[PDB]
Design a protein around this ligand. Structure first.
Ligand code: UMP
Ligand code: UMP
Lengths: 316, 316
């Protein structure tokens, strides 16, 4: 069934995970090393067993794909997923006069006089990102994040490389190429950076007329991250294919540490008794062909008939 | 048994490979995506089923590990594995007066008046690498190759980063770190380069007191490459561990295209009936602890009791 590769990792991390210390203290149980394969000529791997808002995914992606590094695109479609990374530097900055805010994170997460200040503070900022074309430019422009490592990797002497646009075309003119990779691991930018990307490298492969994509993820949160990460790159494998005029093949997700923090066991547990349902189908717009100009309505999912969603404590 | 993960990929590529066109024309049968796991606390994965000269491996490695890019180190221990990359630029150069030599490769491989000229021409050059401290410096120094992408990744404005030395120490001071990666994929140097590395990325992981290493290989030659590539990174996982004072855990080898060219079927076929034998053990010198100062005799293998080797047509 489509998403069974997922439910097999959950099960499998539970069953032979091993307690590991971590970035917070919230242990995780993890495994090192793992591949799971999705025949995308079968349905869209959106998890049926937990409600997943496609909406946040495809726009997160179209922001990647336009070469973007700016919050504003996301807030313009109430996709809040990165705000924290951007509110962070506003708060810790010298225009920011206003409450102490020193790493909210979890200071919010179990303290309510302060998990309220932060809220509007944050919405204060969101508003200020949308509407102030100048503020947005130094506090919303986020710096290095996937849109910028895929489509404008900075060089040694000058310039900036559109790593992805180059790869799509070496898919268009050299399909049998073992050298088709897009990387986001920039070694000079890695010591001192926020989240050194989790989606480190991907690679395409063409065989007999169908595309495929592999993902190396060096770190992963089985419950919050991976259901979303799975549709992101299977959305991408689908977009890039329509562009190259190829059929769809398989999405492969290779993991380095894959992990379940511990205040989430109870939740995965519950999800694991839900009997998966048939998977959604994805129609991509029949006329637009450069994918970089894509927009929301050029992509609309069908039969996603999910279970209810499940709620869960998050990161720090 | 140790090397059975290997013999299962051979079998498995045969059985459901799919003919793919390629760099030469020599088809390959390949698969995209594959992980195989080796519990190194069990023995050294040198293939027992085909004789494998450890010698070339450990010195190839010590050249990587000293940050080297120079032929001479290799020729000094008759490790010829890279000569071709280096003879190439001598021949195609304007000191080189002497025969036409235009990509030997296969012009040697089925033409004997010329698979002789080349031979001494090449030995002419080898000699000239050893003994001419100046020639060696512009024709033996190879440019970008693993010793240089691991230990001196060039930066944007200036400098050069010892990516590996940094990672070993974040193993020494931050063991539970999902961010421990060494990459060799340099995106700016990749369009115009010889062999964009095949061993793209690796990642370490510590759990409960034992190290592990994963390899992403975007391309692979099941018969010639992978038996060697397997001992290289399991040698490395072993060296880096002795340095961090850790036990040994697992080596994971994740493949992108994994492939068998077609004038090699017959050979793997034969090897696949050989009944694997017990695996060798590896003792590393008990006193030296910085691994970067290691040398040949600080590493000596035990009980490698291999089958005979098997001969095979090579690359182009
Ligand atoms: O798309 C994503 C992004 C992040 N994570 C998780 C991985 C870890 O749970 C945490 C990152 O912490 P580090 O790996 O950077 O230490 O976020 C995911 O699983 N999927
Ligand atoms: O350590 C190595 C080095 C190379 N190869 C193989 C991979 C392909 O068979 C060929 C490289 O050609 P490209 O992948 O660069 O196209 O060499 C290996 O299997 N192992």
């Amino acid at each position: 069934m489509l998403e069974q590769p997922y439910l097999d990792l959950a099960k499998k991390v539970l069953d032979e995970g091993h307690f590991k210390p971590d970035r917070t203290h919230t242990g995780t149980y993890s495994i090192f090393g793992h591949q799971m394969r999705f025949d995308l000529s079968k349905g869209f791997p959106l998890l049926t067993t937990k409600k997943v808002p496609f909406g946040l995914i495809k726009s997160q992606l179209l922001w990647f794909l336009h070469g973007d590094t700016n919050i504003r695109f996301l807030l313009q479609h109430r996709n809040h997923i990165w705000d924290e990374w951007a509110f962070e530097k506003w708060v810790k900055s010298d225009e920011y006069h206003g409450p102490d805010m020193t790493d909210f994170g979890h200071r919010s997460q179990k303290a309510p006089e302060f998990a309220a200040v932060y809220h509007e503070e944050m919405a204060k900022f969101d508003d200020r990102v949308l509407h102030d074309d100048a503020f947005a430019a130094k506090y919303g422009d986020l710096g290095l994040v996937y849109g910028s490592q895929w489509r404008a990797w900075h060089t040694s002497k000058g310039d900036t490389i559109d790593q992805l646009g180059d790869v799509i075309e070496q898919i268009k003119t050299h399909p049998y190429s073992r050298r088709l990779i897009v990387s986001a691991w920039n070694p000079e930018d890695v010591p001192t950076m926020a989240l050194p990307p989790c989606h480190t490298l991907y690679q395409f492969y063409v065989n007999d007329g169908k595309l495929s994509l592999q993902l190396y993820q060096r770190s992963a949160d089985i419950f919050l991250g991976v259901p979303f990460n799975i549709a992101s790159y299977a959305l991408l494998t689908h977009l890039v294919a329509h562009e190259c005029g190829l059929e769809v093949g398989e999405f492969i997700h290779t993991f380095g540490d894959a992990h379940l923090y511990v205040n989430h066991l109870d939740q995965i547990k519950e999800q694991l008794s839900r009997t998966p349902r048939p998977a959604p189908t994805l129609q991509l717009n029949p006329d637009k062909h450069d994918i970089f100009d894509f927009d929301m309505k050029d992509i609309k999912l069908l039969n996603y008939d999910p279970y209810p969603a499940i709620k869960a404590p998050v990161a720090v």
